[PDB]
Structure 1
Amino acid sequence: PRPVVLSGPSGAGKSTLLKRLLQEHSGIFGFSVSHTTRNPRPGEENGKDYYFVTREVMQRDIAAGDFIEHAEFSGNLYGTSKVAVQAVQAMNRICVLDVDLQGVRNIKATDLRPIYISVQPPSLHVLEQRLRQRNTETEESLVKRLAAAQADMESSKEPGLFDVVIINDSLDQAYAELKEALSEEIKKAQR
């Protein structure tokens, strides 16, 4: 099977859909634990949700070639390390990655050759509402999210960028569509 890249706007439901997929199919899928320089949100665990490091550690890691890709997003650094992807492969699991649009384009030139899935909100208004209920960003950081989010929604319609686009209105339906898009991936892994 192939690795899986989830991309979409901030708050459209990338994390929520992925977290469920990793519970139902914990034997099939493995999460790529990115590095980030942003502060952990309550409930996030180092080594599970992210590798939480300072900017000095992240830059020294970049200088050492640790990362398949890395991008700056809303004043913080994020990156997919080779070590993170190899950890999933050494477990005999399909690697699932959660990256922004920059990561998608970055990954499009690596040897990962993954499936690309875009998770989109029903409207940009609903996306702002979902981010407000989250309340993990300041209004200065919140405003920057919507600027980057509109670029994601526009690039979702690019002819050869994403393999599957999923509108997250109902989690039951969106996860049902996520499983349907990964049926071939699951079938190959299980054989």
Structure 2
Amino acid sequence: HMSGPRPVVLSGPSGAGKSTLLKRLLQEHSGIFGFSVSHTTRNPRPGEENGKDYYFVTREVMQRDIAAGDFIEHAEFSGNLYGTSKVAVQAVQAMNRICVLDVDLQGVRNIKATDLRPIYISVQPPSLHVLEQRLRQRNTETEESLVKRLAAAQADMESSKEPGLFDVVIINDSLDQAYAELKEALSEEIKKAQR
């Protein structure tokens, strides 16, 4: 489906601030944005809610849906499966809202190959050390997956500099500043959606 406004793809390393920024955006502008609820096989963290943060499913269920053709894209990240189902995006488009997707770098490259035509925004930590500090001060991950996520962060941090890959790169040093720059990147779309 290509009806509705231009979608927004938000990416960046684990722990960079994607969820925090998107939660703020959906709170302030709940009438114009909607969140694509991805499927994942990873376990929920305290406070996460099925059908809101993710559809938390088993690998068997995820695989059956993949085999059925139910996903726009999927990827393996730090030992678990993640994916954007067709219905997750179509539900937001049906409501005439701007669909916001939170995906990894593989997901960005996957979505580039679709007809979705989004704006691509990368959210970056000030440094890898701040990232690790932020990730560990949450400690929702095993050491093994913290290692994998810190490695993927470096690999994907470099690609944020790839010309033409992202439309905007936002360094999340101060959350208030990053959130202003998020809305700046979307200001024309927000104005159109409001009028």
TM-score by length of 2: 0.97
Q: Which contiguous aligned blocks of 4+ residues in structure 1 show a shift greater than 4 angstroms?
A: none
Cα shift readout 1:108-143 (whole Å, capped 9, x = no counterpart): 010110000000000011000000001000111100
CA distance in 2, matches of 1:189, 1:69: 27
- Correspondence for 1:185 among 163, 185, 189: 189
SS of residue matched to 2:161: coil
Cα shift readout 1:69-92 (whole Å, capped 9, x = no counterpart): 000001100000000001101111
CA distance in 2, matches of 1:35, 1:70: 9
SS of residue matched to 2:144: helix
CA distance in 2, matches of 1:39, 1:8: 21
Gaps of 5+ in 1: none
Kindly state the Cα deviation for residue 101 of structure 1 after the two structures are TM-superposed: 0.2
Q: Which residue of 2 aligns with 1:94?
A: 98
Cα shift readout 1:31-74 (whole Å, capped 9, x = no counterpart): 00000000111111100000010000000000000000000001
SS of residue matched to 2:132: helix
CA RMSD of aligned residues (A): 0.6
SS of residue matched to 1:134: coil
Gaps of 5+ in 2: none
- Give the count of matched residue pairs: 191
Kindly state the Cα deviation for residue 189 of structure 1 after the two structures are TM-superposed: 1.6
Q: Which residue of 2 aligns with 1:124?
A: 128
CA distance in 1, matches of 2:117, 2:73: 14
TM-score by length of 1: 0.99
